[PDB]
Subunit: 493 residues, 3 copies
């Protein structure tokens, strides 16, 4: 009779990392007969289309449900009214009355008052979505947003033409919620639930009320909070029986901080660990780190569930070294190019395939040019099928300075590909057996890493032996049955 | 048949100092059969309530009338219309038409358009006063202000939500005046007397016209201008027979200026003294100072009238030293703490009671902590009954660097309390007889002042003898009959 | 069958220099039976009144026509409608409905809402033109501009009360064009031809379309572009047969630039000379300069036509030295005062008459005071009859550092007045024969110029001989028949 609620601010088709885990964690719990659903706290006029696509693409399980604060009230409003809000559509159409249309593109058209030449409206049609912008004294003041010719949301714009206020509409066109938006930072202020004629300080206020309405105050109701920003939404509920857990997915220490600083959102979760049921960390290393620095004891280690897909038909014999990750400073791809340069000198043959995109994509691209490794290092860009990429690698390398567990390397080892990576906080140390299933390089030692890639990339015997021992290892440690038992013990306690 | 008009920009229940004098000066002239009324130049929707309270509290005489520029036209408008301005209240109510109410507090409620969710209005009810704020494109643009459910004033707000324009309404809701307000500084620009369909450059322009309409151009009409900011309102009238006098209530030299600078407003009055009937100064010291530095001769000394209330039943035998004044830099309470420290060392017994509030209240409070005089110096805060406080003092001390006359010390001497104060510009020198009725300490000599407080606070014989000689002195010099004769001589001349 | 179109952004009664030339160039071509008309690209509600006046004053030839982009569409709109746009005038009058009028001056009146006291409108009547400003939340938002009580243009104002959008109306009050105005710089953005329901990126876009509609793509259609800013309006047309020429009227090198920089607008014309029919320069000196610095060869020298008016009845015998020019830095009037000082020392008699106005008028006025030449140097201000001024001069002096040809000095020589000027780029060298018809002073040599003015101003024989030889010379070189033949050769080629 247990029921899990996993919290994250939003869900999207592009969005990854944490969501991927949550999606899979939901499959496992649903398989274990504990419905584990996702709760989001954002507005999306097309959430149905997003979820429908996520499930079609097989990223999200068919069983997994997504609860959303704004949809919750939208349903109350849908049930409350019976005829369409004809007066709203009449208001919109009346505004566009004695006007002349000046087409700019296909969908794009502008509307000017025939009697005065005043600029009235801008309209942009686009398959299913239509946008109507209303002007006043030559400045856009409003934006009516339609999906399938039915309005779902209206926005008011300030002097700097920036959203200062939102209004969401139900399936009949009636307004159910409105809210002030800080134009500068985009922060959500006073939220007005027009359907219930109730005011809320901020969105947090609203979601706290919502979670109290959604989740039954039973010891059987479990709240796992993945998204660290969503933590106080959970933490602030009046629930006295329902269980509250928080999951830390990243190394809690502020990245590139010799001062010993902590990540704001994470620090807050860790600090309150005794005030809730528990704080879940992925590695046992992180658990001890937290217990040492903080005067709190409700910290627990529960690894991510691991998807044990079938290993490729055959090993890669060619000297191809791979890496699949987001292009961000924490991943230190800058160091990867420095190792790549050291490797290609001692052996010209070996090629490096770097999949991914982000901020540092440009810096790394220019870095290859200067180091003259254009014929060896190839930035293969974004990938949608990363499992198919793994088939083509002899070994996977990771320069990452900061990690939570490094599931990416774990996922590589299942595909019988050995990992040569820097021993960092946190993860590699747990699953990489140095000189057995891959190489656990001492941090920053680019010369040692270069030597070990050359060793492994040249011997086809080692690459196959270390790769097979890598999969055998993950299967042993990361047993899905046991990780589930770990959770159950924690819930039933 | 003489009639006096005393000018000050505004009147209020909190307001003090000058107003107190004006109020009492009005009693004396009314007693002498010369009606002396107050003329104000500010908008207050509740002026009746203010005056009613001032007179109930006995601060303002029952006979004293208050003439006000905005009330003057309001009466013309009241007399001009016969039915209520129904169309205005209809306009306001129509704005609040198809709306939904979202209560925040008791009086506070918000109004949103049922068809569109637009934020329409904010309403805050509060016993007699109601406020309606109207919004446009999520920003407040207008504020209708009601008293007893009848609108009296409307305000328009700029982009930074600041008053840029006012409209006052009469007893029927009709507009009689409107005016532009500089949003930055709050300055009043173009004033439009809608009742008379007349435009005015500034408020000065308007009040000048008003004073010409109010005051008869007879030699029997006397204008005393107390408020220095109101001076040009008087000075600029076309009156050829009516008398124009200006009163300087403070030391005309810019405070804390070694350069020998003059106070803008005051300098202007002094400079024009020959162009008007006269400039009245409180002390004979100030009179000579002005005559020396300025090439003008219409300066006269006429002290403040003094209220000779009954002295307390008995003297204070306990070592309690007092001070009742506003907490401002000119009063130099910082020096008072330095004298208090010097005194408490030589005699632990003596306690200091400092009544009053202002800007330097915080600095002085922190100053007592550091000097460790918490058990001796007590900041008794604001007082409403200062005469009752005087009963509890053995002697009154004053560190004030700048004064106009120092009526506060005079008022203390009437209550048979000797004054130990710094000899400054202007006042003490006239009424304090050193080593006879109090101590006239050489300025900044905190060591001499400390020694004299100790002398007086210890000898109960001296404290009673000097205190009695203090009252005997004020009664002699500050004879109410003679001060009145001084004025009469000036008017009849 | 040839037809010329001369381009300049605008035409006005005050405007001079280039326009004067264009006007005269049009007379000559009309006289030679080639209609040469002016094409402008600006809005003026009273263009008719301007042209009517230009032609009355005899500045513009009666035959010369002025084509204007905005008038072009206005005519299409005039022809399209049959009844007056009654609804617009109804809209304006309805806005001014229940209002009270507060007169400020004669034409100036303000309108306030009788029910609420709201500031509605500002109206300023002025003989033929009327202006109505509409306010909203106490701020002007719109300005209806009338000529003979018929509205021609409306303007929308931003938060800083600055024009952000224009709407022009036809002879019936109907809107035909509207356009966005960048409030900061005053730049014209998106132009909407409401009559044709067509959008245009910028004004350039619009005028390019217009020129294509106006000018027939025949080899007989000639486009001369005088105004350098109007160049791309011409340059960007799709015309494959019509001739495109550009005229440079000034020294193309950026003034006061030791770096060897070029004037943006001019550089662009010169750079594209091979892409068009030709680039016309006034002097042969400038032609070579351009051909040297730029890898282009379509540069041609065609002087300005010269108006050979009758020389005065008699020479000026008095020691009067003149100068008629705009007060700008390029003219270097600062140097003229330095020469004037050097001259008046060696001979007190000689007086300097400096006609003109501009920016440096103030600096030069203060410069005469310091140098103490008040009794010799007289700034005669702006002149409307410059030919009558020439009668009163013995000799004309020019300190100008930068010139295009210096027609002003040529015009002086026709009036038999010798020119003593600095040899600069470009012009003087062509028409001044040193020690024959005037003096061609080596640049900056103020001492040599001083000596030559003294020589000439003293000898009445020389002043008459050099002056007569000056006119004889201009007549020879600047033959109107030959300049016309030069153009014809270029067109017919």
């Amino acid at each position: 009779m247990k029921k899990i609620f996993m919290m994250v601010h939003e869900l999207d088709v592009n969005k990854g990392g944490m969501t991927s885990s949550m999606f899979n964690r939901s499959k496992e719990f649903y398989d274990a007969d504990i419905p584990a659903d996702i709760v989001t706290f954002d507005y999306k006029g097309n959430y149905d289309e997003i979820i429908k696509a996520l499930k079609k693409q097989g990223k999200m399980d068919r069983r997994t449900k997504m609860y959303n604060v704004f949809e919750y009230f939208k349903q109350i409003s849908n049930n409350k009214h019976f005829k369409s809000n004809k007066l709203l559509y009449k208001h919109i159409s009346e505004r566009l009355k004695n006007t002349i249309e000046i087409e700019e593109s296909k969908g794009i058209s502008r509307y000017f008052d025939i009697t005065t030449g005043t600029y009235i409206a801008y309209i942009r049609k686009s398959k299913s979505e239509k946008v109507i912008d209303f002007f006043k004294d030559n400045k856009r003041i409003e934006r009516f947003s339609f999906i399938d010719n039915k309005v779902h949301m209206k926005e008011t714009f300030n002097v700097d033409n920036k959203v200062c206020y939102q209004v969401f509409y139900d399936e009949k066109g009636y307004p159910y919620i409105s809210r002030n938006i800080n134009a500068n930072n985009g922060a959500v202020g006073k939220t007005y639930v027009l359907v219930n004629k109730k005011e809320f300080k901020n969105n947090l206020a609203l979601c706290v009320y919502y979670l109290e309405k959604l989740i039954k105050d039973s010891k059987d109701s479990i709240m796992i909070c993945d998204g660290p920003g969503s933590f106080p939404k959970m933490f602030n509920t009046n629930h006295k029986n329902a269980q509250k857990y928080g999951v830390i997915h990243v190394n809690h220490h502020e990245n590139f901080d010799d001062t010993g600083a902590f990540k704001k959102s994470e620090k807050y979760i860790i600090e309150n660990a005794n005030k809730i049921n528990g704080v879940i960390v992925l590695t046992e290393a992180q658990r001890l780190d937290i217990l040492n620095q903080f005067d709190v004891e409700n910290i627990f280690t529960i690894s991510n569930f691991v998807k044990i897909h079938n290993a490729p038909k055959h090993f890669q014999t060619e000297k191809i070294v791979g890496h699949i990750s987001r292009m961000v400073p924490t991943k230190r791809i800058d160091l990867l190019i420095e190792v790549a340069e050291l490797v290609v000198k001692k052996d010209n043959a070996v090629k490096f395939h770097i999949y991914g995109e982000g901020s540092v994509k440009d810096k790394i691209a220019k870095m290859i040019e200067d180091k003259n490794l254009e014929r060896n290092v190839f930035l293969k860009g974004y990938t949608t099928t990363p499992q198919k990429c793994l088939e083509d690698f002899k070994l996977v390398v990771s320069t990452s300075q900061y990690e939570g567990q490094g599931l990416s390397m774990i996922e590589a080892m299942i595909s019988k590909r050995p990992v040569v990576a820097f021993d960092i906080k946190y993860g590699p140390s747990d699953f990489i057996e140095d000189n057995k299933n891959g190489y656990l390089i001492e941090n920053h030692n680019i010369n040692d890493m270069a030597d070990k890639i050359l060793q492994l990339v040249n011997n086809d015997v080692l690459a196959a032996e270390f790769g097979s021992k890598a999969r055998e290892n993950i299967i042993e440690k990361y047993s899905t049955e046991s990780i589930l038992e770990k959770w159950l013990n924690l819930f039933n306690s």
